[PDB]
Write a protein that binds this ligand. Structure first.
Ligand SMILES: *[C@@H]1O[C@H](CO)[C@@H](O[C@@H]2O[C@H](CO)[C@@H](O)[C@H](O)[C@H]2NC(C)=O)[C@H](O)[C@H]1NC(C)=O
Ligand SMILES: CC(C)CCC[C@@H](C)[C@H]1CC[C@H]2[C@@H]3CC=C4C[C@@H](O)CC[C@]4(C)[C@H]3CC[C@]12C
Ligand SMILES: *[C@@H]1O[C@H](CO)[C@@H](O)[C@H](O)[C@H]1NC(C)=O
Ligand SMILES: [K+]
Ligand SMILES: [Mg+2]
Ligand SMILES: [Tl+]
Ligand SMILES: [Tl+]
Lengths: 268, 992, 39
């Protein structure tokens, strides 16, 4: 033929069949032992998610949400993702004492449901009403963005203490139980309005620590609705929403490390 | 074009002096007119040689920039700029990826260009050396007056004059001469002075006395002649053009390189476009379809391989430089290993090029002297009183002297003023009797008759050094038979005795044997003149026989020859044991050529020519079956009337071939004949008459000390110490480097698979990219470099000089067996070890292997800063990318770890590491430096930006260890099978 | 610890780099030693 005879062509096939078969069987074996060394409830390493990311619902083309108020299908793209998220926080999804629980309607302290063990059933998560998100189809004019803190197993978000000076200096400082979120731009051509649990501009600490998908399915993380009823129009406004805390940090590279990058433009 | 120049020349030495003048419109006495000479100048053109048109270095450099790998790397470099252009227009990408990768790849092409350019070097100044043989000026007779003119202004027809010490300015017809002798070594390779006279003495113009040639010099006397040829039209000017004009051609090693380039280029374009369409079918945007292709290019092309080859060659050439063997062309480092036929000059190559005493006949006994340079033989006789009598004649009846200031150099190597035979005798006595000058001071010469054409003898009368005599001793030497007709007694073991027919017959026997050995034989005799008949003041007349020259006492015979170099016989046998055919090709006479052939082992004992059979059986040569003769001796005059097909039959039908009295073109023809049969041929030589053959040879080797400038220009290799044993070393080195290149190539190729497979699974699996493009270049250009080179220092696995020369048609540098092992077996194991570490990194950070399938879409999505892992955690864009790049880093390090084992297995093709050992210090160096480089690239701060290399946790380093070990075991088991059964299965499938 | 389990999300990449570079250097020196056993 090309290389060899039929007899040789066969033998080279019988070899590579057994050979690659063995190699596949060995590869799988090493994957088995790897998995055997891992927990079902908690990942081996968590230093790469460490400082929590802050992500929002409006799917930004490039950290930007520009549209026209005087146009219907101009914002119907951002309403798709906005709906996708809030559709999960339905009351019909949170039914019965299992696996949900009614928690303080005001920001409270942490809740420990034991260890990362299966020695108990599904760890009961705090309910969250999308109805706590006042004012927010969504904002056809002047968007109503929804913030979110990235989930990390066993992470206890710790707010800053009012020992020294603060950006939003001491205003509504629920020091003991709220992780604040203050959006900014100089360039003050807007109108910041925050909505959340208990009416505070933060995340209620009663939703922590997260026990993971395996130990807490259907779990709901707290949301923080933000509305920009800015009196300006037809210009790119670089708005940055920042979260503050002891376990919260940022990076010049990762522009989502505990903060937002939104470029709103109501070009109408 | 040069087929005309490969033919024997035609001449006009047969014409009379007068007749020759009519042909050139010339005067025998007055010479040309100033006006007629200038007319002929403009007509024929200058008496000069024009160098052939060369290829500029520009075109030579750029021709390498387009050879398979460079072509693919160019397509990659441009395709980078393509994707970059498409980006800069569409979505403003502030990145530098495609732009920088395009710059990097273009640089890789340029630098790789320098390496191949360095390897494909051609240092040739043939025509320049020939031009150096034309004198600046010549002496001509114009308008009846002699004047010096620019030799280029010399034309056919003018009257030229030459004298001892000057170069022949052009081909001349001798019309007048006085004691003129010439050095025709340019045409023959033999430096013995040849007389020139107006008389025609041979039909063959290269042998007649009435022609003098350009490229030669007058050694003594004076001559006048008419110019018959000028410039390019001279006999050796044509040889110049032939030699300088010959197409170089591709070396065996070069052909091998291009061959695997085709193979690897083939699989590259195959998988390249095979997966380019496979991606579009899967619905991949052309934006991405090209990005994957660039990666495929980089994965398939072994970026550092061609440069490795060059370095391995260079390092092999450095070792040979250290044995006095200079390599002018890097590729010639290997040709000697692939050589199946050596065509060797005799004089100054196989031989020392110096008349040396070989045997002596005295006391009715043949004695042999030591002919070797360094005198590696033994003594023959010292005791016999006869010896001292013969020794005295050899010293006394001798007019040769050592040049001043030689006392530092060895006797046999020092320059001597005199003819070759007298120098030989001088050096013979000086060696075994001490200072000859002393013997010539103790015995003052009073009268002598120098060797005469008519007398055929030379005699001398000396004052006997003996005090009790202080009388007159007569000594003489000459033609053995002439000396015999002048002897009455023979000095036997001390005492004289009558010359009976018995001893006279033993003389003839001794004389015939020595002459049969191709040796020049001389007779020696002396006579103690009677005291009473010769007073202490008796005057001797040299002009008229004033003393007896008959009834003298015969002392002995001495024989001499230009002997082989000490190492030559043994080197010839070694070449022949390695299955190399050795042919002699010489301008010298057949009797001498044949005798040295037997001396060095070109013609082995018992082997006969058709002429030998005929003489032994006493039958006509036509009655001899030529197939009964494995040896042959072909004279150039017969070679001339043979067609190439008939020359091919001679080459095919004889194992032991001697081509004697060959011209320079004839040497070229014999070389081409050998090549025509498909053989790789080496030429060894030292003369300008070897230049065409040396050029045409696959590898020409010139002698460094004895070699002429031309020969060393025409060669690929120079033996700087004239050590012929270096050929044996050269062939051995050549074979070793050929095997080691295979090892180094397999090693380099093996790591291509773990660079290809990640890109494929990236498409077919939709997982995060396991390894990056930059990461690949860190391997092929970084870590693999020193290890790959180090394989050039591997010792032989067996006695390589015991095997036959490779068949260049069947035995390739890269074959299917190499690809099967490198790509199909070992590289495949490396790929898995890479993937394993990849799955380990991701799974330990929260992305278990199961959830990875079909996630790249969301993984690469720059706007999703919340991807969910297996444990329910959310990752930003840059966070997961850090883990991904950490995966690139450990996959990279996995390659390094699996290349550890590969380096050790590529060490040997057959033998076990437990047999070959670990005595390669460069290889071990490679292991340490490779690992140091990898660690540095991972842990050095800032490398995460420039190369996207991230720090690895200690446990990460050990992921591929079990795969590294399986490689070592697998290959060790496999080679154990090879050795345990030379049959073929494992052998014919995987044996590189 | 409980709410004070910050060490769980921390890794000393600084020490690892220091050690990694020490090792790389020493492997580089060791290599020179073995190579220079004859040049
Ligand atoms: C989650 O809540 C949303 C609230 O808008 C539900 O949307 C409803 O969709 C139905 C049918 O398309 C409409 O008739 C209603 O007007 C919507 N709102 C309400 C309050 O009922 C959505 O269907 C819910 N999703 C799930 C899975 O239950
Ligand atoms: C990533 C995976 C799926 C690709 C696997 C590719 C396999 C099938 C390839 C890789 C190397 C290949 C072999 C390389 C060498 C030879 C020897 C030659 O004389 C005949 C073909 C043969 C035997 C090839 C057959 C196919 C082969 C085994
Ligand atoms: C939000 O909606 C409420 C009614 O639910 C209305 O009273 C109020 O004006 C709205 N706020 C703004 C800022 O438009
Ligand atoms: K050559
Ligand atoms: Mg010679
Ligand atoms: Tl490569
Ligand atoms: Tl490679």
């Amino acid at each position: 033929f090309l290389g060899r005879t039929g007899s040789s062509w066969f033998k080279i096939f019988l070899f590579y069949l057994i050979f690659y078969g063995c190699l596949a069987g060995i590869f799988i074996g090493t994957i088995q032992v790897l998995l055997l060394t891992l927990s079902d409830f908690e990942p081996k390493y968590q230093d790469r998610v460490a400082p929590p990311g802050l992500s929002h619902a409006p799917y930004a083309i490039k950290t930007e949400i520009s549209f026209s108020i005087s146009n219907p299908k101009s914002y119907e793209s951002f309403v798709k993702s906005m709906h996708k998220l809030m559709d999960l926080y339905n009351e019909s999804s949170q039914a019965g004492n299992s696996p949900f629980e009614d928690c303080s309607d005001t920001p409270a302290d942490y809740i420990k449901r034991g260890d990362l063990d299966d020695s108990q059933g599904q760890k009961k998560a705090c309910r969250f009403s999308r109805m706590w998100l006042k004012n927010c189809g969504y904002a056809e004019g002047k968007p109503c963005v929804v913030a979110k803190l990235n989930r990390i197993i066993g992470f206890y978000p710790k707010p800053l203490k009012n020992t020294t000076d603060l950006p939003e200096e001491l205003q509504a400082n629920y020091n003991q139980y709220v992780l604040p979120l203050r959006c900014a731009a100089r360039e003050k051509i807007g109108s910041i309005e925050y909505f959340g649990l208990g009416g505070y501009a933060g995340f209620p600490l009663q939703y922590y620590p997260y026990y993971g998908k395996r130990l807490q399915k259907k779990y709901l993380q707290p949301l923080l609705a933000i509305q920009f009823t800015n009196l300006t129009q037809n210009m790119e406004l670089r708005i940055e929403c920042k979260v503050y805390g002891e376990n919260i940090d940022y990076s010049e590279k990762d522009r989502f490390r505990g903060r937002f990058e939104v470029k709103i433009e109501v070009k109408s | 074009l040069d087929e005309l120049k490969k033919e024997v020349s035609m001449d006009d030495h047969k014409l009379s002096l007068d007749e020759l003048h009519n042909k050139y419109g010339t005067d025998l006495t007055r010479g040309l007119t100033n006006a007629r000479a200038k007319e002929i100048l403009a007509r024929d053109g200058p008496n000069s040689l024009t160098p052939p048109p060369t290829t500029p270095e520009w075109i030579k450099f750029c021709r390498q920039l387009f050879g398979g790998f460079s072509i693919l790397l160019w397509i990659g470099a441009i395709l980078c700029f393509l994707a970059y252009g498409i980006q800069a227009a569409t979505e403003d990408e502030p990145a530098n990826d495609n732009l920088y990768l395009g710059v990097v790849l273009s640089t890789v092409v340029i630098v790789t260009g320098c390496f191949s350019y360095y390897q494909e070097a051609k240092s040739s100044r043939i025509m320049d050396s020939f031009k150096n043989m034309v004198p600046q000026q010549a002496l001509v007779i114009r308008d009846g007056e002699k004047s010096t003119i620019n030799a280029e202004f010399v034309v056919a027809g003018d009257l030229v004059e030459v004298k001892g010490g000057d170069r022949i300015p052009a081909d001349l017809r001798i019309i007048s001469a006085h004691g003129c002798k010439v050095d025709n070594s340019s045409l023959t390779g033999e430096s013995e002075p040849q007389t020139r006279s107006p008389e025609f003495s041979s039909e063959n113009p290269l042998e007649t006395r009435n022609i003098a040639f350009f490229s030669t010099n007058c050694v003594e006397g004076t001559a006048r002649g008419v110019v018959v040829y000028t410039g390019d039209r001279t006999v050796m000017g044509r040889i110049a053009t032939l030699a300088s004009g010959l197409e170089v051609g591709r070396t065996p090693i070069a052909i091998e390189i291009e061959h695997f380039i085709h193979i690897i280029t083939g699989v590259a374009v195959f998988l390249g476009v095979s997966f380019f369409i496979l991606s579009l079918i899967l619905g991949y945007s052309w934006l991405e379809a090209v990005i994957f292709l660039i990666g495929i290019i980089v994965a398939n092309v072994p970026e550092g391989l061609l440069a490795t080859v060059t370095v391995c060659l260079t390092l092999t050439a450095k070792r040979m430089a250290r044995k006095n063997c200079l390599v002018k062309n890097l590729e010639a480092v290997e040709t000697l290993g692939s050589t199946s036929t050596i065509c060797s000059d005799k004089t100054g190559t196989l031989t020392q090029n110096r008349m040396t005493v070989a045997h002596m006949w005295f006391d009715n006994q043949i004695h042999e002297a030591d002919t070797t340079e360094n005198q590696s033989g033994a003594a023959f006789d010292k005791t016999s009183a006869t010896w001292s009598a013969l020794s005295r004649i050899a010293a006394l009846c001798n007019r040769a002297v050592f040049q001043a200031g030689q006392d530092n150099v060895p006797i046999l190597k020092r320059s001597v003023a005199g003819d070759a035979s007298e120098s030989a005798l001088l050096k013979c006595i000086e060696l075994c009797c001490g200072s000859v000058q002393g013997m010539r001071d103790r015995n003052p010469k009073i009268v002598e008759i120098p060797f005469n054409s008519t007398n055929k003898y030379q005699l001398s009368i000396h004052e006997n050094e003996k005090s009790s005599e202080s009388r007159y001793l007569l000594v003489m030497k000459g033609a053995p038979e002439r000396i015999l007709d002048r002897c009455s007694t023979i000095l036997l073991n001390g005492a004289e005795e009558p010359l009976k027919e018995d001893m006279k017959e033993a003389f003839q026997n001794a004389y015939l044997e020595l002459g049969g050995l191709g040796e020049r034989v001389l007779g020696f005799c002396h006579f103690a003149l009677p005291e009473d008949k010769y007073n202490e003041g008796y005057p001797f007349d040299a002009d008229e026989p004033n003393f007896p020259t008959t009834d003298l006492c015969f002392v002995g015979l001495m024989a001499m020859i230009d002997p082989p170099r000490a190492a030559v016989p043994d080197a010839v046998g070694k070449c022949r044991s390695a299955g190399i055919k050795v042919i002699m090709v010489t301008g010298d006479h057949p009797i001498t050529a044949k005798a040295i052939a037997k001396g060095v082992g070109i013609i082995s004992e018992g082997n006969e020519t058709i002429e030998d059979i005929a003489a032994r059986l006493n039958i006509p040569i036509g009655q001899v079956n030529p197939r009964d003769a494995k040896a042959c001796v072909v004279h150039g005059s017969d070679l001339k009337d043979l067609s190439t097909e008939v020359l091919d039959d001679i080459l095919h039908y004889h194992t032991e071939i001697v081509f004697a009295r060959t011209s320079p073109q004839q040497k070229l023809i014999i070389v081409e004949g050998c090549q025509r049969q498909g053989a790789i041929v080496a030429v060894t030589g030292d003369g300008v008459n070897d230049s065409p053959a040396l050029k045409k040879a696959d590898i020409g080797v010139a002698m460094g000390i004895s070699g002429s400038d031309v020969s060393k220009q025409a060669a690929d290799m120079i033996l700087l110490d004239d050590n012929f044993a270096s050929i044996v070393t050269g062939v051995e080195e050549g074979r070793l480097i050929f095997d080691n290149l295979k090892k180094s190539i397999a090693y380099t190729l093996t790591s291509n698979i773990p660079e290809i497979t990640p890109f494929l699974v990236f498409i077919i699996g939709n997982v995060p990219l396991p390894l990056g493009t930059v990461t690949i270049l860190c391997i092929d250009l970084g870590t693999d470099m020193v290890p790959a080179i180090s394989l050039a220092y591997e010792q032989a696995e067996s006695d390589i000089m015991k095997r036959q020369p490779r068949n260049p048609k069947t035995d390739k540098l890269v074959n299917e067996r190499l690809i099967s092992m490198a790509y199909g077996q070992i590289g495949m194991i490396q790929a898995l070890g890479g993937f394993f570490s990849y799955f380990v990194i991701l799974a330990e950070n929260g992305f278990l292997p199961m959830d990875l399938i079909g996630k790249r879409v969301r993984w690469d999505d720059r706007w999703i800063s919340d991807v969910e892992d297996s444990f329910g955690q959310q990752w930003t864009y840059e966070q997961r990318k850090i883990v991904e790049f950490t995966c690139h880093t450990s996959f990279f390090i996995s390659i390094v770890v699996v290349q550890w084992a590969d380096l050790i297995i590529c060490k040997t093709r057959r033998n076990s590491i437990f047999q070959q050992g670990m005595k390669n210090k460069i290889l071990i160096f490679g292991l340490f430096e490779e690992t140091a480089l990898a660690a540095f690239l991972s842990y050095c701060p800032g490398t995460d930006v420039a190369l996207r290399m991230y720090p690895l946790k200690p446990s990460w380093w050990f992921c591929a260890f079990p795969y590294s070990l399986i490689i070592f075991l697998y290959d060790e088991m496999r080679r154990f099978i090879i050795r345990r059964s030379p049959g073929g299965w494992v052998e014919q499938e995987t044996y590189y | 610890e409980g709410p004070d389990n910050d060490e769980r999300f921390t890794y000393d990449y600084y020490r690892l780099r220091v050690v990694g570079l020490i090792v790389a250097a020493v492997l580089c020196v060791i290599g020179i030693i073995i190579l220079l056993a004859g040049k």
